Design a protein around this ligand. Structure first.
Ligand code: HEM
Ligand code: HEM
Ligand SMILES: Cc1cc(N)nc(C[C@@H]2CNC[C@@H]2OCCNCCc2cccc(F)c2)c1
Ligand SMILES: Cc1cc(N)nc(C[C@@H]2CNC[C@@H]2OCCNCCc2cccc(F)c2)c1
Ligand SMILES: C[C@H](O)[C@H](O)[C@H]1CNc2nc(N)[nH]c(=O)c2N1
Ligand SMILES: C[C@H](O)[C@H](O)[C@H]1CNc2nc(N)[nH]c(=O)c2N1
Ligand SMILES: [Zn+2]
Lengths: 402, 404
């Protein structure tokens, strides 16, 4: 009923009691575990709303108070009359932080209480979305001293189409399918790149061309907006000891800003609610730059290092990957842009686990995502058993809107 | 697609559906409420149904399903259970079952080799002395002077009201761990308990970092007996680095033969409590887990100091750099000593081939992602990008709690 959770490095044991609060089923059954899958495939609104309002008044230590009773009344009155309701700004702020706190795949949750929430629910056009997005980027970037933020656009409504940001992140690089079937730039972005061109964008021809935004107001075709280049902070990549590295012309953007996820609070759904923090370096150094289906630079770098590329057992991939990760860290540090390495991040996540154990009796965590893509067992999270489950408020993946 | 789990590879975009999971007769620890896939230890009518299922599997495998020989074997199994409470496997049934248990092991990345397993039948064993003889024969055969051969030796099954055959050691070859006066451990901290148990049963201990442990072998209803492995039987590899000349001076070594000895082999409801098996190492297990785990030999800082890395800060990636060179030293040293070993890149490549093989042969492959993905360089290997479905099939290897 309550899972025992063991840490194999230290021998310590906890019991996860928080999982009993989960009201949403995941993909696993007693017959088979599907934990490694990336996307597994009024009365109800009212109970989700009540539970959320209960969570909110409990957080400000006012459970059972007058304000608590009357707010529940307002919610019931609104839902009974209209089939929906609306959150107060303070409730939205609480809800956004809780969705972050609840996110099982996020190693950065020690920071969960520190989040700037921009209320963009008064947005009525793709143009207004753009202005809000520009302000988010400026605030969050803060000349390299990154600040966590989320901008929340109008909720879904039974009648109409969603507000949507078509881009999966606010800042990404284009991928241009070449004549010879190869890709120039980021192969993950060929489709969105093609959509932008088809919506009137004049493309670059570089490996690191910042994509325009396609923003969608309800039941309208998406509209194209180019980010002012001064707003988009980038970091040229150099290596502390390998001089030829800077000459690879590699770079990455400062701000990791996820724009494709749905934010669910109290049964209400925010289909556009882009959020940003700061990078953990292995994501750039390992996944973005070294994934075979991404920039795939591993062999290039290894040849520059004069490593024997002919055989796996020289561990040329492992050596090149480490140096690339080092270059990312050195470069962001040099440019004075907030970044965290995987050792520091996982140490802080272990602290987060302990804090949550005391605060809530557990912490939903997805081990496959929490353990970094290099040097897994070198981090403390590798030796930590984790219990995974869905708590609400929650961030939810939504498929590309085309 | 159908009502079976959809399984995606994110590097290649390819999709399969796992239909094999329908064959699972045993619950794992997950529910719709919560996933427990990352936990190491998951929390006569019965016998006969497991037996029938296994016999059905055996006759399917030899293409005689529904035949007279198949029906007669089922009747023979039932009549034996009816009169004795148990039954016994034929030689070829044991061979099939042991191979199938390996094939079915979700945590094993080496399964491309599953059909090549030398099965030693030791079901005639009747004393701890004879267990020792069988184990020495296994080690000699498996080691083969460095040209390693996969093998399993199967001792008699669990029986009603009679004690088990048990090997107390978790592996046939492990190093001692000696608790020091200052609280530190000399040798392998993982083995402190077994080391102290060996001393209690009359072993004169060494005082090195790499002292091979004796075996504690238990025959039915007896105290375990102590047996020292003759040193000429235990092949070891001194560790050196191809370019860093000081590495050899560290005096590190590892043994050639990974031989797991504490797992239970379950076949058709029969339980083989002693059935040690062995293959060859994947290099990251030694280089990363055995040598670099904080709770094991913990040599990362030592090696990083020798490499002159800045160990005072995480962002120098000193742990990552040292771990890579230690892993390279292991591969290099085993290759130099002509002892079979496989790197994590070659092993995960072969496992992807295995997945494709099993997709065609059985419609899926149970696999534990957290164990298949190696402990360094995870996403540099193809298995990181492959979704995996985990479920329990029988025949199976199951973990056994220490007999103490
Ligand atoms: C402040 C610094 C932060 C760090 C270092 C961090 C770190 C990470 C990392 C490494 C991942 C896995 C990324 C991947 O491989 O795709 C992740 C995922 C995630 N993070 Fe955090 N994060 C931070 C801030 C935030 C914020 C501000 C939010 C929302 C308010 C958030 C919510 C999420 C969610 C929902 C995921 C899963 C995303 C997905 O499914 O693609 N994180 N984070
Ligand atoms: C032939 C070369 C082999 C290779 C390269 C290999 C590789 C591996 C690796 C890397 C692991 C994870 C070990 C750990 O981290 O503790 C593992 C586990 C396992 N292997 Fe294989 N293996 C091989 C042969 C075998 C054989 C012959 C058997 C049995 C017949 C077997 C059955 C298992 C089982 C049952 C586990 C899980 C053990 C546990 O739960 O502690 N493997 N293997
Ligand atoms: C198919 C699919 C499902 C899903 N849940 N998610 C995705 C995004 C993928 C996950 N892996 C790569 C890519 O995500 C890339 C974006 N990752 C940034 C995470 C981050 C880091 C620091 C601060 C933040 F605010 C956010 C795709
Ligand atoms: C508690 C517990 C549960 C469990 N299932 N397992 C264990 C042994 C642990 C697993 N992780 C480290 C240690 O096992 C160390 C032994 N692993 C050798 C694997 C191997 C490699 C090549 C060929 C083979 F035939 C076998 C402990
Ligand atoms: C198939 C597998 O689940 C998939 O490759 C996951 C593994 N772990 C991950 N972990 C993080 N942090 N981000 C990812 O995109 C992934 N991908
Ligand atoms: C907590 C976690 O499940 C545990 O540390 C696992 C992770 N993956 C592993 N994978 C392998 N191959 N061997 C192990 O011992 C472990 N340990
Ligand atoms: Zn699961």
């Amino acid at each position: 009923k309550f899972p025992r959770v063991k840490n194999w490095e230290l021998g310590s044991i906890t019991y996860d009691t928080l999982c009993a609060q989960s009201q949403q089923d995941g993909p696993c059954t007693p017959r088979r575990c599907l934990g490694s899958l990336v996307l597994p495939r009024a009365e109800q609104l009212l109970s989700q709303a009540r539970d959320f309002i209960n969570q909110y008044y409990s957080s400000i230590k006012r459970s059972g108070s007058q304000a608590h009773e009357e707010r529940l009344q307002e919610v019931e009155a609104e839902v009974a009359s209209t089939g929906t309701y609306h959150l107060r700004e303070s409730e939205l702020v609480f809800g956004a932080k809780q969705a972050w706190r609840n996110a099982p795949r996020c190693v950065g949750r020690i920071q969960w209480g520190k989040l700037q929430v921009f209320d963009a629910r008064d947005c009525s056009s793709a143009q207004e979305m753009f202005t809000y997005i520009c302000n988010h980027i400026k605030y969050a970037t803060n000349r390299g001293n990154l600040r966590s933020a989320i901008t929340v656009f109008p909720q879904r409504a039974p009648g109409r189409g969603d507000f949507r940001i078509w881009n999966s992140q606010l800042v990404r690089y284009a991928g241009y399918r070449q004549q010879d079937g190869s890709v120039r730039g980021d192969p993950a972005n060929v489709e969105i790149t093609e959509l932008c061109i088809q919506h009137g964008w004049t493309p670059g021809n570089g490996r690191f061309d910042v994509l325009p935004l396609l923003l969608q107001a309800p039941d309208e075709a998406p509209e194209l907006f180019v980010l002012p280049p001064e707003l988009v902070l980038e970091v040229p990549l150099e290596h502390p000891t390998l001089e030829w590295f800077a000459a690879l012309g590699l770079r990455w953007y400062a701000l990791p800003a996820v724009s494709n996820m749905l934010l669910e609070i109290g049964g209400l759904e925010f289909s556009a609610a882009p959020f940003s923090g700061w990078y953990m370096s292995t994501e750039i150094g390992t996944r973005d730059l070294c994934d075979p289906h991404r920039y795939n630079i591993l062999e290039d770098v290894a040849v520059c290092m004069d490593l024997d590329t002919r055989t796996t057992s020289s561990l040329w991939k492992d050596k090149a990957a480490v140096e690339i990760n080092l270059a990312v860290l050195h470069s962001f540090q040099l440019a004075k842009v907030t970044i965290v390495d995987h050792h520091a991040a996982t140490v802080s996540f272990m602290k987060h686990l302990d804090n949550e154990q005391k605060a809530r009796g557990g912490c939903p965590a997805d081990w496959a995502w929490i353990v970094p893509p290099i040097s897994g067992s070198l981090t403390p999270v590798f030796h930590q058993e984790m219990v995974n489950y869905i708590l609400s408020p929650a961030f939810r993946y939504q498929p590309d809107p085309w």
